[PDB]
């Protein structure tokens, strides 16, 4: 009774890469490095988007949101390293860069309910 395949875009292997142009300026999103969120993976941590502004490339891709997990960047693994290398590598170099990301199905990354009246 293993896992079954449904779609080629929405599955446990949810993965997508897109090349975007970045110039000397500020990004439209802010990434963050957290822990104890998705232990289903390996014994470490990954980088996930923390904010996005619709209309920007990171949103022009087609199906992007606040949570996309960045895997690589033009063939430059970041795993093992600490947020330090994450913010540094974020700088990049050339404009045209290939960024690897992953968009898992709804139910894997449940947002936490911060103090409030109801919501």
Domain ranges in the chain are 1-119
Experimental method, per PDB record: NMR
Strand locations in the chain (E): 16-21, 31-33, 47-49, 69-73, 96-102
At residue 47, what are phi and psi to the nearest 5 degrees?
Answer: -105, 135
Q: What's the CA gap between 12 and 119, in Å, rounded?
A: 29
* Total Cβ atoms within 10 A of residue 83: 14
The CA dihedral of 38, 42, 44, 47, to the nearest 10 degrees, is: -60
């Amino acid at each position: 009774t293993p896992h079954v395949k449904d779609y080629s875009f929405v599955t446990e292997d949810n993965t997508f890469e897109v090349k975007l142009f970045k110039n000397s300026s500020g990004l439209g999103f802010s990434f963050s490095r957290e822990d104890n969120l998705i232990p289903e993976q390996i014994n470490g941590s990954i980088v996930r988007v923390k904010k996005l502004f619709p209309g920007q490339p990171a949103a022009e891709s087609g199906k992007i949101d606040v949570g996309d997990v960045i895997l690589k960047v033009n063939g430059a693994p970041l795993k093992g390293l600490s947020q330090q290398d994450v913010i540094s590598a974020l700088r990049g170099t050339a404009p045209e860069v290939s960024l690897l990301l992953c968009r898992p199905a709804p139910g894997v990354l449940p947002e936490i309910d911060t103090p409030g009246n109801s919501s």
